[PDB]
Amino acid sequence: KPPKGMFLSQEDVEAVSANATAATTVLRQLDMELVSVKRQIQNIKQTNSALKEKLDGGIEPYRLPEVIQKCNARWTTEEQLLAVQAIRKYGRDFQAISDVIGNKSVVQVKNFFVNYRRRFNIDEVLQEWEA
Amino acid sequence: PRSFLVRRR
Amino acid sequence: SGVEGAAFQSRLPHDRMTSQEAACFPDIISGPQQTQKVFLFIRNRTLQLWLDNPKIQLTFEATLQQLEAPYNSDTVLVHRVHSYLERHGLINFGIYKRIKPLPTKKTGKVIIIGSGVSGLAAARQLQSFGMDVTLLEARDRVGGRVATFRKGNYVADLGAMVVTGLGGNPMAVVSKQVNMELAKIKQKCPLYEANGQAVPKEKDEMVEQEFNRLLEATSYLSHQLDFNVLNNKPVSLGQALEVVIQLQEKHVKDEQIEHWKKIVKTQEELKELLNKMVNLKEKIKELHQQYKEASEVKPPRDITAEFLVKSKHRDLTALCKEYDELAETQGKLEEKLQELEANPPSDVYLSSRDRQILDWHFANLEFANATPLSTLSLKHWDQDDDFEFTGSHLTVRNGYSCVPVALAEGLDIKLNTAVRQVRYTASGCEVIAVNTRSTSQTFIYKCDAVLCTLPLGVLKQQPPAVQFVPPLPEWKTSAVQRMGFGNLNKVVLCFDRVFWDPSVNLFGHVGSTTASRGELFLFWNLYKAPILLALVAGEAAGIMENISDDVIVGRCLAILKGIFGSSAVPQPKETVVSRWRADPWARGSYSYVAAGSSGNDYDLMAQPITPGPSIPGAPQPIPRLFFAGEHTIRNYPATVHGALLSGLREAGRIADQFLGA
Ligand SMILES: Cc1cc2nc3c(=O)[nH]c(=O)nc-3n(C[C@H](O)[C@H](O)[C@H](O)COP(=O)(O)OP(=O)(O)OC[C@H]3O[C@@H](n4cnc5c(N)ncnc54)[C@H](O)[C@@H]3O)c2cc1C
Known part of the structure; x- marks a missing residue:
């Protein structure tokens, strides 16, 4: 039952009493430890200040305008060819392939993978992507 | 002893 | 209740028989619960009667009259109870108009060393029991460590000053018997830092709370973590x-x-x-x-x-x-x-200021125990806490000396009589004293028993101021060596006008350093006349005794000037500076529980000495050498009530031995 806010452990008491100068020793070990952490803060916050300087402007110049094309159910020969190339570059990732074409849902792409597998040798295309 | 302490609380 | 309150005022439990009572009434305490409640009521009632009017002797007859059945049924029981209470000084102690005058025929002869409160209390009890009593006193006055300064209307105690509550205090009884002007102390005590500026309220409260948290912590360190020995030393x-x-x-x-x-x-x-x-x-x-x-x-x-x-x-x-x-x-x-x-x-x-204000609270603690905190036993410094009285602390406006002087009336007191050697044998004792003025005028007092009220400081003195023949046994001398005898001095400043706040009884002064935290750390104003009393506590007490009264008064005026301004602080009319450690009839202020000591040593100090037989193979002699004083009473050490109680105790122990129980 120690007093609230007073800190007194068997371990801490023994460590202060162990020697005649162990008390003064323990307090400087922490004082030195504190200086070594404060200098490491000043180092990393100056390193972090340099990285912030390099990001000045963000990615606003390299930002591309948003395009929202109305998803269509019919596949043009153009769209079919974009897909086969997207399959070759991105493999089995269906979301990337949908983004490339621009007007085909992930389900339609998933359907396409089965429908045209025979005619567009999709199995061969996947093997080439894996290599 | 303790009893003689001033401002006892 | 009225009967339950009488037991409380007598420091007895109202609903239970004590160890002392078990010894004098083994038949009752070993017997049925009903007889015990009858006993306890008779005791409680007899006490109530004495306490309701302690200015006149309470006789056995007077007691029996005011009792009622079935308690007044048994007369021998009522007589045994009244006798125990009278013998052990729980009734008919202090200054009472005696009903039946003392018999001219005295039994036994006792020499009492010291006319302090412990000595005077014992002497009255013994004379009251019809023994021949003579007190030997080295000083030109009675009261010992109760000393009152007097010049005109200026009145200030250099010794005991405070009644530490009337709730269970036998000085409550003495204050109804003697005209003491008991005035309550107002707890409000403002601090003033080195410069003379009051500590800001918000900060004052913070440091005080930290001091109490720090104390509470040392208790936890002691009782819970068992941190009571370090490198063999306590x-x-x-x-x-x-x-x-x-x-x-x-x-x-x-x-x-x-x-x-x-x-x-x-x-x-x-x-x-x-x-x-x-x-x-x-x-x-x-x-x-x-x-x-x-x-x-x-x-x-x-x-x-x-x-x-x-x-x-x-x-x-x-x-x-x-x-x-x-x-x-x-x-x-x-x-x-x-x-x-x-x-x-x-x-x-x-902070540096916080540590200075905290050092004042340590100075207060060094004042209370009259010793540096480095000397106090961690485990046992507060061993008397459970027996502390209840109610507001009081001062004596008349001066505390009014008490011993009152007790000294009708007593054979030899003043200017310094005991040099105490001889105790199977046949009796002789005490060798000298006149303090002409040290060659030698006196020899023959007695059946000697009561030693010599302060612990005097008993400690090396080489000895008083020689014991034969020497005190190792168990007594070891206790004397182990026990702490502290120091605490007072500076009395008498002025023509009050420049301080009359509503504030006492105000602190914070020392520059830790080393000087006790030096004039507190000022008391508790008197009608314009008198301020400065305390020198802790390590400062010992060192300030080797410094002239002028320099000390100087440092006092400086500190007062800083608080109230140079214009407001005049030169004092009369100045007095106590030097209790240098006083050869004290050798310090009062006992403290030193590291390596305990309450158990206070009990060893109270133990009487029995001499060896004169002729070998002769029966075990009776005890001859008895001890009283604040250092002998474990539950009330370093107090006037403690001294008083220790005297009453030894009077009963001596009477029981030499007049029979
Ligand atoms: C500064 C100070 C403040 C105190 N404040 C308080 C307080 O506020 N409240 C409180 O309750 N208590 C207080 N006390 C304690 C109180 O004064 C004592 O506890 C009490 O007076 C002790 O009485 P005593 O009979 O045990 O010893 P003493 O009063 O010392 O009596 C012993 C007597 O022995 C005499 N003597 C010594 N050597 C010899 C010798 N060789 N031959 C003959 N006679 C000798 C002495 O002169 C003295 O008269 C204070 C003490 C001091 C010093």
């Missing part, structure tokens, strides 16, 4: 306080470290994120140029050239999504990092 209260303070200073540092240690962790997360964001900005920059070059190729174009524009477009929006998610994560880490810089933990445990 642990001082001062050592424990040092250890507790150091652990509080450690925690403050430990706390800072953990706070700065979680800032670097946040900065090292930010560093690892910013690096990821810089590398991603480069990949975005490169991939934008690639998209531009692909889009530069104007339509119409084959599907591979179209795919290159589309694939790079989707690849660039993907990387621009990541960077925006990383820019989100960056923003919340920068907020967390600003919150840690906003709420730093405590800088220091206590």
